Paper text:
The structural studies herein confirmed SAV0551 from S. aureus Mu50 as a member of the DJ-1 superfamily and that it has all the pertinent traits of this group, including the sandwich fold and nucleophilic arm. The results demonstrate that SAV0551 is a glyoxalase III that produces non-toxic D-lactate from toxic methylglyoxal independent of any cofactors.
The crystal structure of SAV0551 was determined at 2.6 Å resolution including the additional C-terminal histidine tag. The asymmetric unit contains eight molecules and each of them consists of two domains: a core domain whose similarity to DJ-1 superfamily proteins had been expected and a cap domain, which is also called the ‘P’ region. The Cys190 Sγ interacts with the His191 Nδ1, while the Asp221 carboxylate hydrogen bonds with His191 Nε2. The crystal structure shows that SAV0551 is a compact homodimer. SAV0551 has a deep acidic canyon that winds from the dimeric interface to each side of the subunit, and bowl structure is located on the bottom side.
Residue numbers in the entry:
A (entry chain B): 5 to 290
B (entry chain A): 7 to 293
The structure:
Amino acid sequence: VNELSKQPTPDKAEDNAFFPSPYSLSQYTAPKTDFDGVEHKGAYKDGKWKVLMIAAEERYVLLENGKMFSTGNHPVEMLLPLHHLMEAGFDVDVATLSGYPVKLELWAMPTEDEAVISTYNKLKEKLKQPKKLADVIKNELGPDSDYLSVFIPGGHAAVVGISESEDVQQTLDWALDNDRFIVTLCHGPAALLSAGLNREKSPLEGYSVCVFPDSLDEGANIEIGYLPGRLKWLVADLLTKQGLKVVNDDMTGRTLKDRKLLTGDSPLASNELGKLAVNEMLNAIQ
Amino acid sequence: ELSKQPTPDKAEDNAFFPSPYSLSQYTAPKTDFDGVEHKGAYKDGKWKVLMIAAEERYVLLENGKMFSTGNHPVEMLLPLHHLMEAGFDVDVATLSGYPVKLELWAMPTEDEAVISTYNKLKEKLKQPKKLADVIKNELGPDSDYLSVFIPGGHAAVVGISESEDVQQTLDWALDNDRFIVTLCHGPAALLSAGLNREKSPLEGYSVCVFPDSLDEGANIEIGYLPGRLKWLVADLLTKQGLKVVNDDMTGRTLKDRKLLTGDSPLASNELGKLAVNEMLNAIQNKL
């Protein structure tokens, strides 16, 4: 079990595209999460407030050497926080930039965790046929929106399309203008780069965030064959050049609240970000 | 005996490639390509082809399973070989600028024409233009695009069939006398001309389309599809008032004004020939 290959495994559906190495899956994934119970089982009861998830619809990330990383949204990052929220009484709607199926990193699916798998099963229909984010902006936002918060889970695929979208931009500008939560972790914060699009100054300038660290993406992830190549830019770097305070440089499961921007650093931070989100959302219903 | 069971796709939940049996029947290491007919015929470097390619690989089916598909690589690459050899360059667009999803299991590995065309286009297939950027900067009456090309594969059914960007692209071609060239499930893209309108501008147009009877029947029984399509292309186009000209798959092609179609992967080679001749003839008409 320390003889497992360090080489990335090819994805036969795609040209020159690679899953993470069998060794890296041993160090970074697990059949069970650190989850041990929800705090606020049924606290909210009016059935009005909802979470809006913007998820990833493109699985493949083009790298510097021309190879592609077969990724997706990380499923623990998506599904653990959502177990907390749904159990607290907050229903969930899923959107992608085009209405395409949601792409997960199914190689990180913790197959033995009941809470995550049943969460995945309650969400399957919405993941396979999401709403179109432009349809959401047009009809379901504005000042009387029933959406209390926007959730952007991570995984490497969040780096693509979501980081340079005017539809994501408009969605962030609503949540600031209506005092709504933006919840995000991992690479999820690349979504935030969309706020500064076609603009001299991002309206998130001076916000503080947890971000997956540069040094891991450029070093350790590349040497254990998790990524088969180098990213062409890095999320923590470009968030800084837009005037955000990247409050961490390590991967400790750290979480952070700054006004209504709640963030997590990595997959390790999933279970806690779920608690933070539930807590801060029940705190704003008064 | 090859199995008629769909083969799982590791990358996606409850998703399947076609069954080994269906592959042994519907795919081949070689195409019937037997040469282009107008090598070097167009020599100004002005006119080009705008290809609109599929960027989603998974089709959700009536039974909850997903078909792992993409654009058909023969329907794509063979017509582009003809056009490129004739002297027309090609630019690739998708609806978001995501990479092009091909049905890599249909890739004829032994065919020099198709592999060659693929390797030239690799760069552009992996980083396409975004169709709306194209709409904003590269259409109008002085566009260097002489045709739009939409290839089939079952993936054309997704997005492209309900897109405002594809709709404006088709309006542009009608209004500036450009070719629309499509085949197989690709004509599903033409349903976009009818978005938010009582009457599609493509009403009364006659087309070749992959037949309803094969998708509902044979494709299911040999495990090419792992379940039924929720809607059928010939059926929806007929409902928008296009005339669907074929009920079978035989490699039939049709020209109706500047809309050139073929019925299936069988038509690929004759459609490239047909596009090239039509475009060369249109260039000779303007002098």
